[PDB]
């Protein structure tokens, strides 16, 4: 996501938040998340609704607003962005879609994003990554190869 949001994404926030605050006077309640809560399945204890407005109350007024809610939302946008990055990335590399990252698909994808690579090169970079040493890339490995 990054940082500053777009106007369209910031009014539908609003209309999202807009549900939260069942009595509309511009904060979230631990009564009113619970409400919400329930209706989606759950069953939250009263310690725990207090901590989830807690966790996102920054003035400690002990309820949420709007920009409380937006920016717990931004950080969950982002963090899904990321990790939905994570795995594009590996399905363009994934050139035969079955999970794997091949040393000939690391080749290939590799040269076609401008990066030609020597046959040594194509192996130590799979080897580095290779952690259970089956020859192949798997999802786990590439995340922990890409985040580190
Ligand atoms: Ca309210
Ligand atoms: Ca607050
Ligand atoms: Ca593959
Ligand atoms: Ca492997």
Redesign the pocket.
């Known amino acids: 996501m990054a940082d500053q949001l777009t106007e369209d994404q910031i009014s539908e926030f609003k209309e999202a938040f807009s549900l939260f605050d069942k009595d509309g006077d511009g904060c979230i309640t631990t009564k009113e998340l619970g409400t919400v809560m329930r209706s989606l399945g759950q069953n939250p204890t009263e310690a725990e609704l207090q901590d989830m407005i807690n966790e996102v109350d920054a003035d400690g007024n002990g309820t949420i607003d709007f920009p409380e809610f937006l920016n717990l939302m931004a950080r969950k946008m982002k963090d899904t962005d990321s990790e939905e990055e994570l795995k594009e990335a590996f399905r363009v590399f994934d050139k035969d879609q079955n999970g794997f990252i091949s040393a000939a698909e690391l080749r290939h994808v590799m040269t076609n994003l401008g990066e030609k690579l020597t046959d040594e090169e194509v192996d130590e970079m799979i080897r580095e990554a290779?952690?259970?040493?089956?020859g192949?890339?798997?999802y786990d490995?590439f995340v922990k190869v890409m985040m580190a």
């Open positions: 290779d952690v259970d040493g089956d192949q890339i798997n490995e």
